[PDB]
Paper text:
The helicase-primase D5, composed of six identical 90 kDa subunits, is required for DNA replication. As the ribonucleotide hydrolase activity of D5323–785 had also been indistinguishable from D5fl, we used the D5323–785 construct for high-resolution work, assisted by an Alphafold2 prediction, which yielded a structure of D5 with a high reliability index and allowed us to assign five domains: the primase domain and a distinct Zn-binding (or Cys-cluster) domain in the N-terminal polypeptide not present in D5323–785 used for cryo-EM reconstruction, a collar domain, an AAA+ helicase domain, and a C-terminal domain. The sample used for the cryo-EM data collection contained a roughly equimolar complex of D5323–785 hexamer with a dsDNA 30-mer obtained by mixing.
Cryo-EM of D5323–785 yielded a variety of projections that generated an electron density map with a nominal resolution of 4.1 Å based on the half-set Fourier shell correlation when six-fold symmetry was inferred. The density corresponding to the collar domain is defined best with estimated local resolutions of 3.9 to 4.5 Å (a sample of the density is shown in Figure 3b). The electron density of the C-terminal domain was also weaker, requiring a lower contour level. Due to the low resolution of the C-terminal domain, the final model stayed as close as possible to the Alphafold2 model. The refined structure of D5323–785 conserves largely the geometrical quality of the initial Alphafold2 model (third column), which it matches very well with an rms deviation of 1.3 Å for all atoms. The hexamer shows a central channel with a minimal diameter of about 16 Å at three points of constriction: the level of the basic cluster in the collar domain (21 Å), the β-hairpin loop (16 Å), and the DNA binding loop in the AAA+ helicase domain (18 Å). The channel would just be sufficiently wide for the passage of dsDNA. In our structure, any additional electron density, which could be interpreted as nucleotide, was missing so that no information about the nucleotide-binding site could be obtained.
Numbering used by the authors:
A (entry chain B), B (entry chain A), C (entry chain C), D (entry chain D): 321 to 631, 645 to 782
Amino acid sequence: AMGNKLFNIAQRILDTNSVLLTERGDYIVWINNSWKFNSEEPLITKLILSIRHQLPKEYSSELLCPRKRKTVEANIRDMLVDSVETDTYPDKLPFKNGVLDLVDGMFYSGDDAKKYTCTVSTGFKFDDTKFVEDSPEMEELMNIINDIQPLTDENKKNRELYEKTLSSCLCGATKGCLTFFFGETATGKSTTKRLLKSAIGDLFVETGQTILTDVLDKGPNPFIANMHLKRSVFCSELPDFACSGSKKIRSDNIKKLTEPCVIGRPCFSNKINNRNHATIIIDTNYKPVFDRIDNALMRRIAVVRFRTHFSYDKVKLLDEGLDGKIQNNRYRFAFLYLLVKWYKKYHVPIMKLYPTPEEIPDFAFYLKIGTLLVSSSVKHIPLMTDLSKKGYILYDNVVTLPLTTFQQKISKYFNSRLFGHDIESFINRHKKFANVSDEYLQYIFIEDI
Amino acid sequence: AMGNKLFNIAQRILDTNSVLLTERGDYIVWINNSWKFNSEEPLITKLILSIRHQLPKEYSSELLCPRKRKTVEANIRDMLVDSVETDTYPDKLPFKNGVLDLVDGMFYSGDDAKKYTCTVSTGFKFDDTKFVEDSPEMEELMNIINDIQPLTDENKKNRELYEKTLSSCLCGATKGCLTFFFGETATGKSTTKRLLKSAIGDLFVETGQTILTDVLDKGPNPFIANMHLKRSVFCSELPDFACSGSKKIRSDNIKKLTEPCVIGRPCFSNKINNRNHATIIIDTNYKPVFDRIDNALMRRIAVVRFRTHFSYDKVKLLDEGLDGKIQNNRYRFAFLYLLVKWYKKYHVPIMKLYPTPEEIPDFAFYLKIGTLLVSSSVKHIPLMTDLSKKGYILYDNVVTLPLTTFQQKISKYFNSRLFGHDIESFINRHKKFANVSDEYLQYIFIEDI
Amino acid sequence: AMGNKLFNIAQRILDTNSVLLTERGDYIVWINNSWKFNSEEPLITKLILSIRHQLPKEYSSELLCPRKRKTVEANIRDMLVDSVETDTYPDKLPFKNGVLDLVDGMFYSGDDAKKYTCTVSTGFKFDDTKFVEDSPEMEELMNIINDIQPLTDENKKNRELYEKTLSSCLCGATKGCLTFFFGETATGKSTTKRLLKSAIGDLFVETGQTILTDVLDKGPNPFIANMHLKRSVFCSELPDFACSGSKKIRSDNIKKLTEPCVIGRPCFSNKINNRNHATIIIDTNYKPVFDRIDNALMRRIAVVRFRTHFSYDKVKLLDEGLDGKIQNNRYRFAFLYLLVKWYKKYHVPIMKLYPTPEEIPDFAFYLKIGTLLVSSSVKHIPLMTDLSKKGYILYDNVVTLPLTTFQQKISKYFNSRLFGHDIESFINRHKKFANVSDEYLQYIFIEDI
Amino acid sequence: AMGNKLFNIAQRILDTNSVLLTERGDYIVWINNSWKFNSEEPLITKLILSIRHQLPKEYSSELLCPRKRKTVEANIRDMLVDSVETDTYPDKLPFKNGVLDLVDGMFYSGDDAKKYTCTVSTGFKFDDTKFVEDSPEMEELMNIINDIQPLTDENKKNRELYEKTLSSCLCGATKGCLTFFFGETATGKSTTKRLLKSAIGDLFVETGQTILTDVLDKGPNPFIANMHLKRSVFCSELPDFACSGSKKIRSDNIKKLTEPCVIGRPCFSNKINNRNHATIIIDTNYKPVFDRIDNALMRRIAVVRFRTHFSYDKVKLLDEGLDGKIQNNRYRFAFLYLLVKWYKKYHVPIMKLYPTPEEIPDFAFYLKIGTLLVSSSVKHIPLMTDLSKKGYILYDNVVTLPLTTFQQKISKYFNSRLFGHDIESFINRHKKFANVSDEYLQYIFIEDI
């Protein structure tokens, strides 16, 4: 003994596509020009109460009743079967008033933004009037950024990489190459972090050294749970790697947070499948030291140096009143305009994240090795005719070089006194013993091919 | 004071067999040509709302009411008594549009797929138009795979085993022999993993070294919980086994993940009985080192080597743009067609997984021992007439060989300098002491029978 | 089959804005001139029962029914969509009778206080009659405070900083500089803590050494959960830092509790985003010793010394009966008046928290270093023409000073015998090796520019 | 479609103030002359069913219905807004028949006790007939107590302190000074504990060494949760402090359980704010040894010695049948009368708890130090004219005494052989080094002022 019109109301509600079912089995609603979502309290009832006005008068009176409204909510829940995924596009930026595009830079609102289904938003209302380049705040922030990173040819590559990383912080896609902020304390890294956080609102997230030094997938992991559906990750607090007791940046962790779907359990929920749209920028004051080094990690890591102090490459005075404007979001829209311009300059139309392993001594050593230490293969076997008199003894049909000769030759190209531990670790990892003592390495110099 | 027609509606719904009760006490529904299932929210109400159209007009109006719909759902729950198990067949591949067969290669959809009850699906809609061999993507992917594994007689066995393992990744049956991917970094293992994951969608799963180096059944285990009802398991991140601190591949774990029903507790649920349909491929860069070695493990382990680098057996240049096509699923259906062809070539009509222990030095040593070190028995007792003058002293009615003689003879067939630790461990594990010092081993050479 | 007038009642209730939805997804109500809030039991029903009197007679009779009242509560929950944040203003002090302003010192009540949405309150009813300067309690408490901190020129800076910190305890904004209470046992720190707690009621909170010596974000953290939305944090029980086993004040923790939004998980709830409005005063009896020292921490730390004992700078007799008046809140409103006067004197109109690192020997050493040890840069490279004969050898295009020369010169300005460990730690942290032994530091004296 | 009279019934119920809302958000009821309270099951329905008799006949018939009774309960819950706190008075003792006053010694019952809102009760019905001094049980118990503590001038102070502590066990206020029971095994401490427990019923609580030797605020803490709203805490089982492995009585814990509101988390509930009305008596057999010693702790600790054994100051025979009478509560009301008389003698009208640190050798040493070792100050600087020739060298404008002179002088007043460890710890804690070796202490003898 119930009503029949309520199913028609539910069908009309589903016609507008104002409520969608996520791939995680959660229901989202489109209210106040924003895809609001809440797993704890279902927002379907609020959606119905909101959109009662967009329906004929014969239905709003029916929807005024909470019993009938819950009935319509149940009907909508039954009708939503296809678990349509959301947040597909990486080139759209959601706001509290709509969605701002990164391709053309135009801001959408209302039903134009409704075409996009964003799980989150920037956390503040968009303002085109404040989103203009012709403003004193824009010039002030441009000068501040140029102080942080000079527009000099010596810093040209570093400045360009810094701009590319800050622009990629906008993109809602998987990060292809981790980025590091190298320098000293208060060299511009913290100011950049604060400006980016103020610009992107709730999309920003900050964390410590846990994800870089500890195991991620072990029971609950609130850090990874919060990092999901984010736009940028800032990892500060890195320890003195030379000093004892400081954990290394685990390459397993780096390979873990470089995938579209990163595992990790949230708190009292099943959300292990996490979408990773965040540009992870690591704030540190020392040169990074890792546990495992290989070509994949060297292609996964970019380094942005900071060489300008504010009491290096340039020394200026401290601006104590700068932080107050950042906390008041004075340079929020100016920084957003700068980020949009950088995205248009670099990442439009294709996202690009190229590594800079040459900025790390360990990765530079490994690259200079891999260039001159190509691994032996079947194609290298016919080189024995010339390598027999060059010290290469053929062991197990592999061109093998004696350890003593390998060390005497690697001391010629690398500073053995500076690279002592690195050479020792490379030898201990990549050497093979003939019987007990005739230790050899299966790598051939270019000068011997 | 309720209705009587609702029970008739429930009986009609159960006539179509659109809702089934699993062996785990969970209810599945058949909506949108897919066996959708959800333990959190019962999908029976959605099933009724969907199939109201497949019923006379006198019943759809009744079903429009959520109260009566919940009543029908309760009736269906009461009527479902026989806990019919699902996912029986290993030769069927489920899709978002139906089920693709591996016997004939024909794709079923609609009620044809409804005959099959698949707990999961590949996670994407099937497309026969893209599932064709006559396509440029197929040729490109064939060339890429041939680069990863050449079609050479020297690599013929390795390539054939690699194809067999990738085809067995499709089969929804228990794995009979674990498979290893041996090589260096970025030798083709990661590309194969990405291609297989893109091809099989949600059926793919990836994990670390925990299941291979740690204890599985200890409280909650989300890894095993996710691995259930899967088609393939990829285990990357294996440590340098020669270096200290790196755990060994526990043979107990290997024997644990080689059964149709593998124990392991999920998170806040009772699903310890897990169906294992996954082909576990282990990505590593070193030769594996285990904790326990025996004939069962040697028959449980297959090794697929990778001998082609992309800057070995062949060295080529790097294709940086290859990963973008994989992430865009350009070679998804081409890889699926290749997998289907391999399954037809090898696993049709009978699944076969034969071990290759000869690719591991430890297993090769153990096999060469077991051939020449047959254990003494009652049948070997009458050999004493000839073995008394051959050094075999009869102890406890067992043909016993002195430890010194055993070592002096095992040094003849095995390189003692290379196999020092292996011989020492075998002696310490399989020797017996006569009184305190006349240590003997209960094994006889073939040259002495 | 329900009523239509109930939605009109809900609309009238929402017209008064007596119920708001927080950013945390929680509902607050305005009853008895106070923004009462409870996550466990929804107070909306109580709000409706209270404000039935502020509605026409045709609606109070409807609201007398708990069924209709729950219906109206559901309607209000549906109508509350915009998650309006609360506790914006830092210059307003909430009471059980209203809100007391810090700008003009006038107390608001009723609808005047309703304009302000305070999550918490001082926990006691305001009394303007007791909030007067012309009272014997005010003079007694002024004399007591002057005994605790004399109004002498030698103590002028310390007394002024103490007053500024106690006034900032009122402000509901983020703390910009941590404050320390240094002295001996019962030198006035405990009396100040008790007086401040009695003055500010529930806004006060006290904790131990856990947040200063341990990791905050690790699972549940009831300390941080209680510290949220607070006005002041008192950290007593600091250990003897010279003695072994005593943990150092972690600079990571200090940087953690200096942000408007501090992470940390509560008990069985999702409230990791915590608003930090608390002035953290650390009660200690020793000079602090930290794990990491830098300019940011030196700008984050202020020190208030206590130099007057009550049996230093002054010694008096003990007042045993003082604590009884504090526990009876005799000097509650007098201390509140003093705090308001201090806030008007210092923090009106702008909150200011300036560090005093010169009160810590470690920070004084670091400041005297950083003044005379400016780091080398590109601008310092052209100084080589004069620094070549001054001992500065150019290494890697950096002005480098030998370690022996650096030590022989740092012994001239700092007492090496007193600063032995500090100099050793600074050398071990900031030195670089040329090859193996020619250790250098990249810092230049002012006398050499 | 409900009734209107039910709200009138709820208003009449709230008129009697038979149900109150606690500060913890819990509801209490007044049934059977007792403020019964239960967080698990709301007792409001039972209260309504009980007080239906105190209402006109037109309302009891309405209240007979459980549906209408639950409706009235909901109305009462809505009407209870002001979270009135309970258990204010420290001078009232609750019983199962009412409340017994400590000021005049008169027992209240019915509505007279209803004026008082006690969270707990003594757990047994009061009996004025058994609450008389003229009874053989009173004389027997007086003789037993005099055996436990003689009425001798040598024991006069100890007996008086023991009586004061036992009387303060009645007071429902915060303890101002911790009390210790010192002696040997079965010297009267256990008998006193049993008698007090039998006298005060459920108000008594007993615990081990955890709260005195471990950290309180670490997750759940059922000990502190049970100790809340109690009248006395007995801590037995103290270990041999001289032996290794025995934890010290943490002064941090002592300062923690000496506040009206003591933190500590209960089990699966939010009751961290705990009211501490309990007199904590510590049962031990050794002299206490602490981790931190200062004037605050010396003023926080009282010691009651036991010097009469029952096979010291007196030795008698064992009364084996004494415990049976205690377990049968024969001396319950006699002990209650004795406690009331002691409260009238000492704590009426003002609660007093004065420390006795002279009973502990460590505290006696510290007091004798602090008398003769007044810390140097600015007022002590002008004493340099006479202290320059007395060995006091002026360092950093502080009167400093050499360590060798300090030791040679402290050996004159204290037995250095007995106080070796104490003097060593005091030196290691309170000394300062001039440069590396000229160690000094900033304390001046009285003989030098």
